[PDB]
Amino acid sequence: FYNDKQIDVENFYIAELPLTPSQFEEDFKEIHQIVMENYSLYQAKHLNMDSLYQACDARVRQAQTTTDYGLIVQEYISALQCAHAITCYKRYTANQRVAFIEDFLFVDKPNDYLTEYGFQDKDRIIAINGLPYKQWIEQNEKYTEASTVPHRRLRTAYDAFRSYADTLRNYTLLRGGDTLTVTLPLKQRDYFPDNEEQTVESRILQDSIGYLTIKTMMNPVMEDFKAVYPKVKDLPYLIIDVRRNGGGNSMNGVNICKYFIREAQPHCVSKSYIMQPEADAYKGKIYLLTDTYTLSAAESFTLDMKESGNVTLIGEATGGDTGNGPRPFCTKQRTYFRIPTRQPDVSSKGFPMEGIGIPPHHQVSQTVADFMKDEDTVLNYAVGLITE
């Protein structure tokens, strides 16, 4: 039982960890003790903790630099197989969106930095550092924290342009039938501006169908939501998009859900909270677009929406972790990490709250053919259902 408030963390590059090599093994032993005493999911996951600890400890005993050490810690934490069992390390980055569509990897709208190095929209990444991209993904999943195989693959694909250690990366690209190679520096995250983009947007498709994108559950989502919701609230159909929503604040998910339900319902993560429909709750037909990326607060939202009976889900199964109460911990030598501490739970309808994506009502996948034409398969599907 955690009486104390959550500690602040420090975020380091692994090349710059404050501890010395003589301290590596003591530190790792403390990380493992903390995990065994506090991580709530390893028993239910049937993890072989004995073998994991020993494999990592053997490596820690041979580690010479803080980069060597930090990579082992990254692998250890990732081996806990939970989207919210994570390290706090910083990553070198090109701050770039990718598309991972039918198991192919594409540059999705190169930012100005990528444009400086000659990347083009929809360039297909064939290889990374000379390794065929599928092999690269499989070899890098060991550094990725995830509860499900699809999400682990997606997060790793989405790391094509970032690294805990690497400050340079090579790409082999397919561009209109030609193959080429490009070398790109990976920069500190503070090289790029923060996003001041809207968290929520809305527009009207075909005069009668509202479209509302909820990109995060972090503040200021409620203010952006309340500013744009009135544009669509009186339309007979509404498509809500959480495909790019990786979480934030679960209570913001609750606040938004109350606009889209018709009767009282307990919140899946905290069932003592009875969600009552807002006075200005929406009375039309609702569709919710989901993806493997959808996670955490966005997944508790998705689950509440699904279980309401008032929302049709379209897309891919979600990422597979509503949260389970992650908390930060710190070793005596300032190694910081976060792990869930809440026991495994199920929804009111028996759905496990971690370890499996929420299935949609209509499973629909983005295609490469549509991607090349800037067509959104899942959105087009939802519009089609409405127009039947």
Side-chain angles (χ1 to χ4, degrees), residues 66-81:
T66 61
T67 300
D68 290 340
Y69 183 65
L71 288 175
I72 299 156
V73 173
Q74 190 60 43
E75 289 183 49
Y76 175 80
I77 295 295
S78 298
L80 300 180
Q81 301 189 348

Side-chain angles (χ1 to χ4, degrees), residues 58-123:
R59 289 168 62 191
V60 165
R61 288 179 182 205
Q62 305 301 331
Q64 301 303 315
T65 71
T66 61
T67 300
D68 290 340
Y69 183 65
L71 288 175
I72 299 156
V73 173
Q74 190 60 43
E75 289 183 49
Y76 175 80
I77 295 295
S78 298
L80 300 180
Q81 301 189 348
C82 177
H84 296 76
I86 63 174
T87 65
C88 299
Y89 299 137
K90 290 186 168 171
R91 288 182 284 185
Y92 297 108
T93 191
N95 198 42
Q96 179 62 49
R97 187 177 269 18
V98 295
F100 188 49
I101 291 171
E102 298 194 78
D103 206 35
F104 292 105
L105 185 55
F106 301 90
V107 178
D108 192 8
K109 306 298 177 207
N111 62 25
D112 288 346
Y113 180 67
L114 260 75
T115 298
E116 300 175 14
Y117 286 87
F119 291 83
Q120 301 188 11
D121 194 27
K122 310 189 190 290
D123 280 345

Side-chain angles (χ1 to χ4, degrees), residues 263-275 304 307 348:
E263 62 183 283
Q265 181 182 337
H267 174 46
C268 62
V269 169
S270 187
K271 298 180 181 66
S272 56
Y273 192 105
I274 309 304
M275 300 183 297
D304 281 345
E307 293 193 355
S348 296

Side-chain angles (χ1 to χ4, degrees), residues 102 288 290-292 306 312-318 358-367 377-378 381-382 385:
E102 298 194 78
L288 179 63
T290 66
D291 190 53
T292 306
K306 190 185 183 178
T312 300
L313 276 57
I314 306 171
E316 304 276 14
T318 64
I358 300 162
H361 295 112
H362 299 284
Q363 192 282 322
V364 184
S365 295
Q366 180 64 47
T367 67
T377 312
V378 170
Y381 188 106
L385 286 176

